[PDB]
Amino acid sequence: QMVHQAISPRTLNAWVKVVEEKAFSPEVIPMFSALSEGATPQDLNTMLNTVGGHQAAMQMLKETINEEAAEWDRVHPVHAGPIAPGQMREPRGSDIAGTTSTLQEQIGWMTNNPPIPVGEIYKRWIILGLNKIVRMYSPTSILDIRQGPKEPFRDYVDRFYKTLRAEQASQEVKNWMTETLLVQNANPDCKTILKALGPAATLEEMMTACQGVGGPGHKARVLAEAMSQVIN
Amino acid sequence: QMVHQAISPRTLNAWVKVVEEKAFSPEVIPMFSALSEGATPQDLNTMLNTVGGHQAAMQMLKETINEEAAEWDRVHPVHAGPIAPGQMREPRGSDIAGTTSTLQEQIGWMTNNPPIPVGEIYKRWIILGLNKIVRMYSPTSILDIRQGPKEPFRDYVDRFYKTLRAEQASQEVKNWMTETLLVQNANPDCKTILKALGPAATLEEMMTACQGVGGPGHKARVLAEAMSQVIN
Amino acid sequence: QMVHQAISPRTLNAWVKVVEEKAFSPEVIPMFSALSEGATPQDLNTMLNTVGGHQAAMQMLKETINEEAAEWDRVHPVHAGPIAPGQMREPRGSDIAGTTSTLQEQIGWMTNNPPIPVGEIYKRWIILGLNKIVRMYSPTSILDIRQGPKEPFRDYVDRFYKTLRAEQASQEVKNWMTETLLVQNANPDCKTILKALGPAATLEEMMTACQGVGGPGHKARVLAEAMSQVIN
Amino acid sequence: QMVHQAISPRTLNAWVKVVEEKAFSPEVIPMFSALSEGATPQDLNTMLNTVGGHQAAMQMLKETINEEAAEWDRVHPVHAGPIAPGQMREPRGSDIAGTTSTLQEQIGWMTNNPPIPVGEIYKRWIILGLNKIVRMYSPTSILDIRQGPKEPFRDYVDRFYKTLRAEQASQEVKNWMTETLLVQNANPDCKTILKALGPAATLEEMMTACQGVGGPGHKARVLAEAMSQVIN
Amino acid sequence: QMVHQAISPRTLNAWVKVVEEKAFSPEVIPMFSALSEGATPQDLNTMLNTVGGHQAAMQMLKETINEEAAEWDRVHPVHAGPIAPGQMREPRGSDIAGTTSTLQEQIGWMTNNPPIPVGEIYKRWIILGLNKIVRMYSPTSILDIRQGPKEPFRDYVDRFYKTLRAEQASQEVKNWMTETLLVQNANPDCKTILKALGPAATLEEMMTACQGVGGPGHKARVLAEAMSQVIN
Ligand SMILES: CC(C)(C#Cc1ccc(-c2ccc(Cl)c3c(NS(C)(=O)=O)nn(CC(F)(F)F)c23)c([C@H](Cc2cc(F)cc(F)c2)NC(=O)Cn2nc(C(F)(F)F)c3c2C(F)(F)[C@@H]2C[C@H]32)n1)S(C)(=O)=O
Ligand SMILES: CC(C)(C#Cc1ccc(-c2ccc(Cl)c3c(NS(C)(=O)=O)nn(CC(F)(F)F)c23)c([C@H](Cc2cc(F)cc(F)c2)NC(=O)Cn2nc(C(F)(F)F)c3c2C(F)(F)[C@@H]2C[C@H]32)n1)S(C)(=O)=O
Ligand SMILES: CC(C)(C#Cc1ccc(-c2ccc(Cl)c3c(NS(C)(=O)=O)nn(CC(F)(F)F)c23)c([C@H](Cc2cc(F)cc(F)c2)NC(=O)Cn2nc(C(F)(F)F)c3c2C(F)(F)[C@@H]2C[C@H]32)n1)S(C)(=O)=O
Ligand SMILES: CC(C)(C#Cc1ccc(-c2ccc(Cl)c3c(NS(C)(=O)=O)nn(CC(F)(F)F)c23)c([C@H](Cc2cc(F)cc(F)c2)NC(=O)Cn2nc(C(F)(F)F)c3c2C(F)(F)[C@@H]2C[C@H]32)n1)S(C)(=O)=O
Numbered sequence A, B, C, D, E: 001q002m003v004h005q006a007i008s009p010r011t012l013n014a015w016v017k018v019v020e021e022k023a024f025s026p027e028v029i030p031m032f033s034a035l036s037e038g039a040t041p042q043d044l045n046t047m048l049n050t051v052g053g054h055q056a057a058m059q060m061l062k063e064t065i066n067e068e069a070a071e072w073d074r075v076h077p078v079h080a081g082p083i084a085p086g087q088m089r090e091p092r093g094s095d096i097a098g099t100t101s102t103l104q105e106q107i108g109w110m111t112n113n114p115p116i117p118v119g120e121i122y123k124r125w126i127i128l129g130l131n132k133i134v135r136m137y138s139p140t141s142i143l144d145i146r147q148g149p150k151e152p153f154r155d156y157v158d159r160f161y162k163t164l165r166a167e168q169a170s171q172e173v174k175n176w177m178t179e180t181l182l183v184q185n186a187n188p189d190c191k192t193i194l195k196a197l198g199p200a201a202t203l204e205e206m207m208t209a210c211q212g213v214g215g216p217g218h219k220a221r222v223l224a225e226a227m228s229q230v231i232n
């Protein structure tokens, strides 16, 4: 037969925009519940594959799906023997998840009498994964990258640029983030030097200027400055 | 038969990441060319539907595809007469674009003898559209929203928030953009008042303070201050 | 039969020069796409084996190819039974990647009716790997090796020479890099000592001169110098 | 038969615009590869013939194509002579490039069973040529035409006007280039005289004024001025 | 039959790494002799085609191979008459070089009774070529580009950038090379001006500042300054 509730182009685009705009806020759960209703496991897998970024969250979702597939296998004992020509094989957990089943098999299960709604079962598994992501997963934010009090400026710059590469933004916005947040979120010891350097300093100049922060000479210099302020 | 070069989960995710990270920089043309080789028009349509945002760009792409389909229809004249039972209908432009053709028909055209590579024809049409986008389309940027010299502060705030809603960023990043760019990119007449308000000013207080800029009272007051400087 | 699109000597040399000149900049993706079109998986493997250096990137590419081969195996079920004498075995994921297939088998698949373009499928897998490399892989640079603020000079020298051995350069250029960058990219505490040492100092004398930096005596001496400057 | 992927008017116009806008930046390689897919060698030659200017680059491309045709002829031995009435002659290197083959022969090769993708082979040869151009060819720029320290002003003017005639620009832009760059890019010895002449000076007047630069009289005069400054 | 000593992926990669790391130092001769032993002329040609850069060296090697092939043809007289059906044609010099012989013919010669080791003969020819390269070929070096005493700065800059384009380095290393060596290896007359310009000067500003060096004005000015020092 045919699946009447196969996802339309606008449904897929709406799901993509939901993920891009809201990330994994709780709002994602109702949206996925409504956009994916009636769809085959193949359509749900398409929707899950359209998620860009958030690799850790997607791995969490995959783990949850695998656990639910194991639970399905536990509850449904394997039947051994020759299947009737009219009948078809009973779904397994991987069949529900669509890893070991074709679209035709999923449609056959969904449109059979009695019907096995593999799409809805898989949808509930995905919802469990999404709930776990919403509770547990925290996406990386370039706004959260601050230099530690004893962190070398080079390591902080490396973390900043890694997070910026993972950041969802336009290249112009990422350039503006580099120009604004990197110096601002440095620790006070490095920030003093960076401000003394001037606004026109390049990254190499900034990195050389802070290369000694925490070394013997810089420690002695700041200690002597504080002691001189005290004596005066 | 079956299509061996149907897009895999990783192929679709790579396309999604390419669009999210590069927007419509020229790099999008090779990637789409390489990620979509040998795919059916249905897979191409899926890839196009996973593009979030850039609605004007997608409208441009659709116009280009429609014009290419019209060109195909002009080149291939429709032949009147019943098709042979072992033969299938010759594709029209809409058939290549995937609008009026099913996946089975596309596979039949691609795997026939002689083959009609509808996927590759549609790929070239999409590449023409993408080239037009890369040449002529410029995405909206929150960094580009600046108050006009005579523009009311309300209108500028409205434009800023519309562009922010359209911006591809996390909610925390969007909040930071609101806290940073809105006052910064205001015109000097509003910006002096906004600075006089102080950092703690809310949006409504900021908008009330600038409500009279350009009115008779504000014009008279600034002229009076300037002539106070002059006749000092 | 024969493969009409086997890579020519100039095609292979062009690929080698692309890798040597641009490393894994995005330009590598279109170039590989155009140089390898119509080639057997054996030719693509020949092209991949000519990449000198970038071992981590090539391991990434191999992981991507293995994932795509697993996806192929998942989508193509194994058929058990006696193959027809006029027929050949259906390609598996390793067969497309060329690990478990011979050049004759690849040519037979590519030139059969219906054809299985194993070269094109493998090319898309390699393109996915190259896209991952372009996005995620960053080659080591001798210019990026700087001494940490608390790093011993000997450890920094070891890191510098390891990176220099990995660097793509002529031996004369590498000697010039040793003569220019090693002292330049040392931290301020070691740089002071190295500059006081003189331009004729050897590597052993430089390591001896900086051997005590961060030790108790050096710390006391720099502290005393700072305090003396403060008292005076 | 007929070629389904024959270049459309928009495809050819896009190729022309790509060449006009980007000259031979790396971007030309993907665009060509995308615009020329599935086309006959005749369409490829039409695409190549629309390149205006860059004659040296076109010559390099022709040399690369001839080299690839020679390689093809080396790999494919010439048949004995008994051509089957139902079969057609096997293509040579010149047939792949379309110099000695007609459109009908190219279509026959492309649509035959087994197929010989003469268009794609030729496209690979053209891509090799374009890669050579991108790597090696540098277009002449009016911005780079500067007078040598001992170059006569007449010779520099002649070089400037030759380059300007070769430059891609409108006549008004060329006139503005003449009014701006010619005096600006002269050597200091001629530039001083040109500045002393005044903005209204014509080309003939400037050329007459600089006719003596480097001669014994001008050298003696400039030396005398320098010595007079020294004595005073 | 089959060639048991066909080059493995690691053999080819080792040869590529040898050429990239050692260029044509004498170490290349043993390495090539060891990696290539027992291989067909086709494998030898692959290894030679994987050499990027050093085009003059490769031309020398090709000339040496052609002369050795001529020597082989002189020593082995061509015999007129039909070859025996069980026998194969006797190799010519081009057959040993692999230009006019297919892989099947090479394998047939190497595995015949008595055997003709065309691979070993070709290897000795290549060794002669590599020896000629090691003795007579010196690769271009960016470190060797120095401005002549009265070379115009523009010509020296052109030479520097051509050599830099030919240089085997990463783009970052080439940028650093431009930042360091170009001013450093200018002649003293231009170098004084370049230092007077300052570190922030662009290439166009440097070319304008040195455009007059060697012209009448600059010669008179420097002579006048020297005479000022003398008559001081
Ligand atoms: C052809 C088509 C119709 C299809 C299909 C199709 C079929 C099956 C599956 C699949 C479903 C369920 C399980 Cl439980 C496993 C499994 N279990 S296992 C042995 O432990 O790994 N494997 N698969 C791969 C299988 F089946 F192919 F083997 C699956 C997918 C998933 C959909 C999915 C994506 C996701 F993110 C998280 C999920 F929970 C499920 N997509 C992938 O898995 C590929 N992926 N994975 C991960 C990650 F690791 F981060 F989670 C990532 C991807 C990514 F999308 F690239 C993206 C960056 C993130 N799609 S179409 C048009 O969409 O291409
Ligand atoms: C079921 C499935 C396999 C399928 C399919 C499927 C089938 C056909 C088409 C389609 C293709 C070509 C043309 Cl030429 C037309 C057409 N020509 S017409 C009379 O002028 O409108 N109509 N269609 C709708 C048709 F065919 F249904 F009639 C099409 C699509 C397109 C793919 C596409 C997306 C795109 F962005 C630009 C394109 F050029 C083509 N997607 C849509 O069209 C929906 N869309 N449109 C637009 C816009 F208008 F902005 F461009 C937008 C969307 C959006 F994705 F929401 C996104 C915000 C942007 N997908 S699946 C798993 O992928 O869901
Ligand atoms: C004879 C010939 C025609 C052939 C062939 C030939 C045949 C197969 C393969 C191969 C292809 C695909 C997979 Cl998926 C695996 C696999 N999968 S596995 C079980 O997990 O390891 N193994 N192979 C080895 C196999 F098949 F032989 F078993 C492969 C290769 C690869 C080509 C390749 C190179 C590459 F860099 C990255 C790739 F993704 C694929 N070359 C190698 O792999 C050897 N290599 N590997 C790595 C690394 F580890 F860094 F990635 C490195 C090399 C290196 F080249 F030395 C270089 C330093 C880097 N070539 S010829 C003229 O070319 O000599
Ligand atoms: C009927 C029709 C459909 C056709 C065809 C048609 C057929 C063949 C060829 C051709 C193709 C390949 C080779 Cl390898 C040779 C060859 N090899 S050879 C013995 O060394 O000269 N000769 N030809 C002439 C041949 F075959 F006709 F004899 C060719 C062309 C080329 C296409 C081409 C253009 C190009 F720029 C660079 C190329 F590599 C290939 N166009 C020309 O060559 C004319 N050209 N050449 C050069 C230059 F020298 F600068 F590169 C220039 C032109 C120019 F366009 F004027 C432009 C200023 C530059 N077109 S159409 C479109 O006319 O209506």
Ligand SMILES: CC(C)(C#Cc1ccc(-c2ccc(Cl)c3c(NS(C)(=O)=O)nn(CC(F)(F)F)c23)c([C@H](Cc2cc(F)cc(F)c2)NC(=O)Cn2nc(C(F)(F)F)c3c2C(F)(F)[C@@H]2C[C@H]32)n1)S(C)(=O)=O
Residues within 6 Å of the ligand: C007, C008, C009, C010, C012, C013, C014, C046, D071, D074, E042, E044, E045, E046, E047, E048, E049, E050, E051, E053, E055, E056, E058, E059, E061, E062, E063, E065, E066, E097, E098, E099, E100
């Ligand atoms: C298909 C395959 C199995 C094969 C083969 C294959 C077959 C033959 C040959 C060949 C061998 C010997 C001679 Cl004596 C001649 C010849 N004699 S002649 C009439 O005077 O020119 N011609 N050939 C071309 C022939 F045979 F096609 F006619 C050859 C090559 C050579 C191998 C080679 C490379 C080399 F550097 C120096 C050599 F001495 C020999 N590679 C080329 O020639 C292409 N090349 N040439 C030169 C240069 F000119 F600089 F030396 C350059 C290249 C380059 F690689 F691009 C690189 C920049 C340098 N490869 S595979 C997988 O490897 O692609």
Ligand SMILES: C=C(C)[C@@H]1CC[C@]2(C(=O)O)CC[C@]3(C)[C@H](CC[C@@H]4[C@@]5(C)CC[C@H](OC(=O)CC(C)(C)C(=O)O)C(C)(C)[C@@H]5CC[C@]43C)[C@@H]12
Residues within 6 Å of the ligand: D227, E223, E227, E231
């Ligand atoms: C009589 C005078 C008024 C004064 C009073 C005394 C005097 C003084 O102290 O001023 C002693 C120094 C001299 C003699 C001047 C006169 C001028 C000359 C002269 C400027 C002459 C032109 C010559 O130039 C050339 O030959 C051109 C050149 C490029 C070198 C070439 O052709 O190769 C040079 C060599 C540059 C000299 C330098 C010596 C002095 C200053 C004298």
Ligand SMILES: O=P(O)(O)O[C@H]1[C@H](OP(=O)(O)O)[C@H](OP(=O)(O)O)[C@H](OP(=O)(O)O)[C@@H](OP(=O)(O)O)[C@H]1OP(=O)(O)O
Residues within 6 Å of the ligand: A214, A219, C214, C219
């Ligand atoms: O007590 P110490 O044995 O002398 O330890 C010191 C000291 O650590 P203490 O807090 O225990 O005193 C310093 O201070 P902390 O950072 O750990 O708070 C620390 O680092 P800093 O000097 O940068 O502050 C480092 O001192 P050093 O920089 O010399 O490594 C360390 O080791 P030392 O014994 O070598 O001084």
Ligand SMILES: O=P(O)(O)O[C@H]1[C@H](OP(=O)(O)O)[C@H](OP(=O)(O)O)[C@H](OP(=O)(O)O)[C@@H](OP(=O)(O)O)[C@H]1OP(=O)(O)O
Residues within 6 Å of the ligand: D150, D214, E150, E214
């Ligand atoms: O000074 P240059 O820029 O190099 O050019 C030359 C050159 O001088 P050099 O010795 O430095 O090369 C000539 O040679 P000399 O006599 O000084 O040895 C000299 O005179 P001659 O040409 O007669 O030999 C004179 O050349 P000119 O007669 O043109 O003045 C001079 O100046 P120019 O740069 O103007 O040629």
